[PDB]
Amino acid sequence: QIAAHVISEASSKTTSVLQWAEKGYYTMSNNLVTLENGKQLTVKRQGLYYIYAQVTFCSNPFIASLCLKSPGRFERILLRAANTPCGQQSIHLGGVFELQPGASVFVNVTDPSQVSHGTGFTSFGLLKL
Amino acid sequence: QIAAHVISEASTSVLQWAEKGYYTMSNNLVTLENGKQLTVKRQGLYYIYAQVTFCSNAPFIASLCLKSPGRFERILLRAANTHSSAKPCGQQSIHLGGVFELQPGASVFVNVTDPSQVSHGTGFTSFGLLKL
Amino acid sequence: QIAAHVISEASSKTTSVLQWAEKGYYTMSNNLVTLENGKQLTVKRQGLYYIYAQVTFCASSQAPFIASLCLKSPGRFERILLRAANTKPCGQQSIHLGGVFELQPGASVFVNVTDPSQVSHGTGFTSFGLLKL
Ligand SMILES: O=C(NCc1cccc(-c2ccccc2)c1)c1cc(-c2cc(C(=O)N[C@@H](C(=O)O)C3CCCCC3)nc(C(=O)N3CCC[C@@H]3Cn3cccc3)c2)cc(C(=O)N2CCC[C@@H]2CN2CCCC2)n1
Ligand SMILES: *[C@@H]1O[C@H](CO)[C@@H](O)[C@H](O)[C@H]1NC(C)=O
Ligand SMILES: *[C@@H]1O[C@H](CO)[C@@H](O)[C@H](O)[C@H]1NC(C)=O
Ligand SMILES: *[C@H]1O[C@H](CO)[C@@H](O)[C@H](O)[C@H]1NC(C)=O
């Protein structure tokens, strides 16, 4: 069975792209999915994947985005959710998408500083169907 | 494995969907009828989901509905948003999901109170299911 | 495949715990999940479940409306897994709680609220379910 579940970490850099860590409660033994550069999940096998994120952030429009990338292919949106305590809320994204070997999915946000990083807060993962 | 993911269509309180872009229609055991209804072919257990985004500019209500063959339609799920009021447009995403048992020929679709407020920009609004 | 979907029923402002029924278009896939005492979803088998609920709602202050997903586990005290807290008439709003959790044999989950009187019970507005992964 092919699945990764990965957890948020403060990005350090500039971008809208969230940075993730292999801090999960499961061991992706397989390698059929990998976390590259703490930014993206890259799969090795072609398939129908259920892909998800949860993004927890502080308020005071906020948009999370699940995107798809591949060598030779500009980034492309798969999913987007908008939202309008410390104002704290959650965006959840999830869907089925067909993925090819080498493909990567990643998450990006309008404001990375607003987001809450701990385990239990912001995650991102998938599982092959 | 039987699964569908369908994309919002540039448009009628019942939302339209397109088989275009990064959509998925695993097989002929699921299909999109009239660009409006996901109709399954086999009986079983389905996670069904929907995301509606809208200018939160009475509450906006999105509903998931079921047309079983031989039976009048019923509501499956509904979500309400009270939108004060809430900026220039004030985009909001509303999601509906559940585990439902479906009959051959069963079709689900998604209803909304104000079709003019829904966002069609890429990724914002989508509909699918998968067999469990 | 182990899954549940239950429907809201009205309840007294005497408990904070919400009430559910196997009525209308519900799911109780097999004997390994049940709805106990109109109130808790109880699993016979251990493992990884995705648990979701959606509650729709409308005072002496402007204290938020708050919904809590609770876990009761054999020989354990109850604990809170998730809280959603929200800041007319009436101002109909849906709030969602959900996530994935490792449940022990005979674990029970339920939903707490602030004002059960204000929760909407019209068809499809308030719901509770789970799915073993
Ligand atoms: O948030 C989810 N959606 C976003 C969402 C939420 C709410 C609403 C919506 C929405 C979208 C559109 C419209 C409306 C609403 C979206 C979500 C999360 C997870 C999930 C999360 C995690 C994860 O928190 N994990 C851990 C970690 O690692 O720290 C745990 C944290 C604490 C407990 C133990 C570790 N773990 C797993 C999981 O199963 N994992 C983890 C990695 C491998 C292992 C499985 N495994 C074990 C042995 C071998 C393999 C799965 C799975 C799934 C998932 O599938 N759903 C979601 C429900 C149905 C579907 C079930 N199906 C069946 C096959 C595919 C889809 N949706
Ligand atoms: C969609 O259809 C239902 C059932 O046919 C109807 O009662 C309702 O008014 C509609 N739901 C919404 C949210 O507009
Ligand atoms: C809900 O959860 C527990 C019951 O065990 C309790 O700590 C909390 O006070 C409850 N919430 C409300 C609003 O009563
Ligand atoms: C991040 O990704 C897309 C793809 O390039 C970009 O268009 C968008 O502006 C960014 N996402 C958000 C949520 O701003």
CATH 2.40.50.140 fits B1-132, yes or no: no
Reduced to 3 states (helix: H, G, I; strand: E, B; else coil), residue A28 is: coil
Mutation pick for ligand 2 pocket among B15, B65, B81, B109 (CB with most ligand atoms within 8 Å): B65
* Cα C36 → chain centroid: 12
Q: What is the resolution of this structure in A?
A: 2.5
CA B33 to CA B41: how far, in whole Å?
A: 12
Q: Is the CB of B81 under 6 A from ligand 2?
A: no
Residues of B in contact with A92 (CB under 8 A): 95
Mutation pick for ligand 2 pocket among B13, B52, B71, B109 (CB with most ligand atoms within 8 Å): B13
Reduced to 3 states (helix: H, G, I; strand: E, B; else coil), residue B11 is: coil
Residues of C in contact with B97 (CB under 8 A): 52
Task: List chains touching B (3+ CB pairs under 8 A).
Answer: A, C
Q: C126, exposed or middle or buried, with CB in 10 Å at 0-12, 13-18, 19+?
A: buried
For ligand 3, atom 2, the nearest C-alpha belongs to C112
Query: Does C122 touch chain B if contact means CB atoms closer than 8 Å?
Result: yes
CATH topology of domain A1-129: Jelly Rolls (2.60.120)
Contact criterion met (CB below 8 Å) for B61 and C12: no
CA C131 to CA B7: how far, in whole Å?
A: 25
* Closest CA relative to residue B93, chosen from A17, A112, C128, A80: A80
The answer to whether the Cβ–Cβ distance between A92 and C85 falls below 8 Å is no
Beta bridge partners of C79: C71
Contact criterion met (CB below 8 Å) for C41 and C130: yes
For ligand 2, atom 4, the nearest C-alpha belongs to B75
For chain A, list the strands marked E by DSSP.
3-9, 19-21, 33-36, 40-43, 47-57, 62-70, 73-83, 89-99, 104-109, 123-128
Distance B111 CA to ligand 2 centre (A): 6
- Helices and strands, counts by H and E, chain C: 0, 11
The answer to whether the Cβ–Cβ distance between C129 and B98 falls below 8 Å is yes
Residues of A in contact with B123 (CB under 8 A): 65-66, 77-80
Reduced to 3 states (helix: H, G, I; strand: E, B; else coil), residue C79 is: strand
CA A100 to CA A102: how far, in whole Å?
A: 6
* Cα B6 → chain centroid: 9
CATH of domain C1-133: 2.60.120.40
In whole angstroms, how far apart are CA B4 and each of A26, A61, B103, B131, C68? Answer: 28, 29, 16, 9, 32
Residues of B in contact with C96 (CB under 8 A): 95
Q: How was this structure determined?
A: X-ray
Angle made by CA atoms B34, B39, B44, in degrees to the nearest 5:
175
In whole angstroms, how far apart are CA C133 and each of A36, B46, C13, C103? Answer: 26, 14, 35, 11
CA C82 to CA C98: how far, in whole Å?
A: 7
Distance C47 CA to ligand 3 centre (A): 25
Radius of gyration of chain C from Cα atoms?
A: 14
Q: How many CB atoms lie within 10 A of CB C62?
A: 6
CA C19 to CA C38: how far, in whole Å?
A: 5
Beta bridge partners of B46: B100, B131
